[PDB]
Design a protein around this ligand. Structure first.
Ligand SMILES: C=C(c1ccccc1)[C@@]12CC[C@@H](O)[C@@H]1CC(CCCCCCCCCOP(=O)(O)OCC[N+](C)(C)C)=C2c1ccccc1
Lengths: 242, 10
C-alpha cells in the first residue's frame, strides 16, 4: 500500500466522522424537540439543515487546509462560492459508496433511510438528480474508490482552474498539478487492476459538477419562492452570486 | 456577503 506523502497531508484535514455525525443529529433532535407538531419541520426542511451543518464541516475542513489558509479571505470566499455545491454532492456520494447499500440512502448523521421512501417525496427535478447520483455511486464502487482518492477529488474541486479574479491564481495552479500528480501515481500504483481508473476518475467530476449546478439553481429558486426554510449560511450561499 | 467572511476572517 503506497501512499504519496502529499496525500498523507491531505487526509489529516478530514474531520472525525463518528463525532460530527453525533454533532449533527444531536443538533437536529433538539431543534424538533423545541417545537409542537404544528411547528415540526418537513422532510425538506430537515434535509436543508443537514446540508447546512455539512457546510459548517466543509468550511472548518477547508480552513484546516494549509494551502487554503495561504490565501486571503477574498480568494478564499471565491473558491468556496464556486465549489460548495459540488463538494456537498461529492461528500454525499462518498457516504453512499462507503456506508451505503443499493436501495438505501445514508445521511451525514449516519441515518439509513430507504431510497423509495425518500424519493416518493421529491419532485421530478430532485428524483432525476438523486437517481443520477445513485448511478455515479455505483460506478465508483466498482472502481474501488478509496478514501485517499476521495480527498484528492475534494481539493481538486476546491482549487478550481475555472475560478477567475483570484489574487494568487498561481498558487491554485500549483495545487491543481500537485494533486493531479499525486492521485495518478497512487491510483496506478495501488490499483493496477483498473489501468484506467484515474482516467475515469476525472471523468466524473464534470458529471458531479453538472448535478451541483442543477441542484444549486433549484434551491435558489425555491428560496426565492419562500419554500426554503432559513438555515443560516446556506441561505446567503445562494443569496449571494446565485 | 458578510457572514461567510466572518467564518473565514476568524
Ligand atoms: C443537495 C442536497 C439537498 C439539500 C437540501 C434539500 C434537498 C437536497 C443533498 C446533498 C447532501 C444532502 O445532505 C442533501 C440531501 C440530499 C438527498 C435528499 C433529497 C430530499 C428528498 C425530499 C425533499 C423535498 C423537496 O421538495 P421539492 O423537490 O422541491 O418538491 C416537493 C413539493 N412540490 C414542489 C412537489 C410541490 C441531497 C442530494 C440531492 C440531489 C442529488 C444528490 C444528493
Amino acid at each position: 500500500a503506497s501512499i504519496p506523502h502529499l496525500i498523507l497531508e491531505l487526509l489529516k484535514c478530514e474531520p472525525d466522522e463518528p463525532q460530527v455525525q453525533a454533532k449533527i443529529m444531536a443538533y437536529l433532535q433538539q431543534e424538533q424537540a423545541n417545537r409542537s407538531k404544528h411547528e415540526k419541520l418537513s422532510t425538506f426542511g430537515l434535509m436543508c439543515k443537514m446540508a447546512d451543518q455539512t457546510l459548517f464541516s466543509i468550511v472548518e475542513w477547508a480552513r484546516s487546509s494549509i494551502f487554503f489558509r495561504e490565501l486571503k479571505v477574498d480568494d478564499q470566499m471565491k473558491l468556496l462560492q464556486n465549489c460548495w455545491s459540488e463538494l456537498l454532492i461529492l461528500d454525499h456520494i462518498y457516504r453512499q459508496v462507503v456506508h451505503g447499500k443499493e436501495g438505501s440512502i445514508f445521511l451525514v448523521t449516519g441515518q439509513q433511510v430507504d431510497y423509495s421512501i425518500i424519493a416518493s417525496q421529491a419532485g421530478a427535478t430532485l428524483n432525476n438528480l438523486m437517481s443520477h447520483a445513485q448511478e455515479l455511486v455505483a460506478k465508483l464502487r466498482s472502481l474501488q474508490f478509496d478514501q485517499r482518492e476521495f480527498v484528492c477529488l475534494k481539493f481538486l474541486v476546491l482549487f478550481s482552474l475555472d475560478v477567475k479574479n483570484l489574487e494568487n491564481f498561481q498558487l491554485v495552479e500549483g495545487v491543481q498539478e500537485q494533486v493531479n500528480a499525486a492521485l495518478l501515481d497512487y491510483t496506478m500504483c495501488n490499483y493496477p487492476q483498473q489501468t484506467e481508473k484515474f482516467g475515469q476518475l476525472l471523468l466524473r467530476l464534470p458529471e458531479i459538477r453538472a448535478i451541483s449546478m442543477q441542484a444549486e439553481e433549484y434551491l435558489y429558486y425555491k428560496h426565492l419562492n419562500g419554500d426554503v426554510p432559513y438555515n443560516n449560511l446556506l441561505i446567503e450561499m445562494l443569496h449571494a452570486k446565485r | 456577503n458578510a457572514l461567510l467572511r466572518y467564518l473565514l476572517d476568524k
